[PDB]
């Protein structure tokens, strides 16, 4: 395995851990805030993904400091990951156009 491919793999593993830990902690931050809805694990899990993907429907979102601090980590994980895959694909493609020119 080439590095770009390892780091994407690493980032996909690490993204999943962030999505799960994120779900757990979002519920743990958000319970105790009256009106908070991000307060059960299953939909937390859905929230974490709609967050890391930057889709962000807003059906759900945090309203407490630590919710928001957890949310900011999920986003960054999301964006970094979905930009290391791109960087990896860009390096795979560049490699293949180098061979198709003889280099």
């Amino acid at each position: 395995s080439a590095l770009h491919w390892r780091a994407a793999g690493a980032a996909t593993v690490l993204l999943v851990i962030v999505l799960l830990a994120g779900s757990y902690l979002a519920v743990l931050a958000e319970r105790g805030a009256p009106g908070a809805q991000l307060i059960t694990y299953p939909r937390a899990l859905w929230w974490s993904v709609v967050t890391a993907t930057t889709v962000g429907y807003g059906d759900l979102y945090p309203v407490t400091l630590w919710g928001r601090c957890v949310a900011v980590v999920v986003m960054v994980a999301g964006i970094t990951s979905f930009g290391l895959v791109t960087a990896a694909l860009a390096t795979w493609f560049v490699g293949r156009e180098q061979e198709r020119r003889g280099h």
Partner: antibody, heavy 118, light 108 residues
Framework: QVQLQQPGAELVKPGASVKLSCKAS????????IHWVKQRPGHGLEWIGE????????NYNEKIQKKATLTADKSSSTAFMQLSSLTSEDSAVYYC???????????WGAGTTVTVSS | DILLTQSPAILSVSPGERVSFSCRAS??????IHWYQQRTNGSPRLLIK???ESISGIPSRFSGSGSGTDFTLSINSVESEDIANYYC?????????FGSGTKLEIKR
Amino acid sequence: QVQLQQPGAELVKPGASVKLSCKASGYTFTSDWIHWVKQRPGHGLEWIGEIIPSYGRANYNEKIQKKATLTADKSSSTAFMQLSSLTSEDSAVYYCARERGDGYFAVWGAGTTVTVSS
Amino acid sequence: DILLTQSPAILSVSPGERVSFSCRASQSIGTDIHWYQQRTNGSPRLLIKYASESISGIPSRFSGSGSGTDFTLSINSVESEDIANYYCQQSNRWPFTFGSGTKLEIKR
């Protein structure tokens, strides 16, 4: 196998305090919340508070006076609720109940009848 | 804090007849309503979760229905064992809240 095990009764002198136990058997998870629910005679169910024994965080009913303080013993699988400086208002049955963090109370204890008198 | 309203408080039905209990949320809670039975001197017992879903253990005689603000627990053909106090309970917004409750009462 009875999952939530609670004392039948505690007598308490007005002004005094009391620690209610709730020993849990069956599947435990990290995810699990223990809840406490107050029922005065001929009245209905009131949500007091919740604790997650794994991380030890608890939350309580703002909407009522904050008599209670919640604790767990990770090792002995027990939740405690500490009701302090009681009066006859506080004379009720206190149920504990297990919620998997998915919103419903799947299982309840038999509750503890707490009587505040001299 | 979401307000659960159970009218009527008492429900008089005849043996084997269909009965429905109403639970209205002060604001849309989706399907995040749960129904409990409490007989005299008993602890609460989950009948229905997320408005409609069966609990295994519970008679098929029990169903729920509803979305947003209007919810409904129904018993097709009531019998004596059904005599108890019914409560609804929301999980949609912190903190969880309960219905004031409704008494099922059979005229025999």
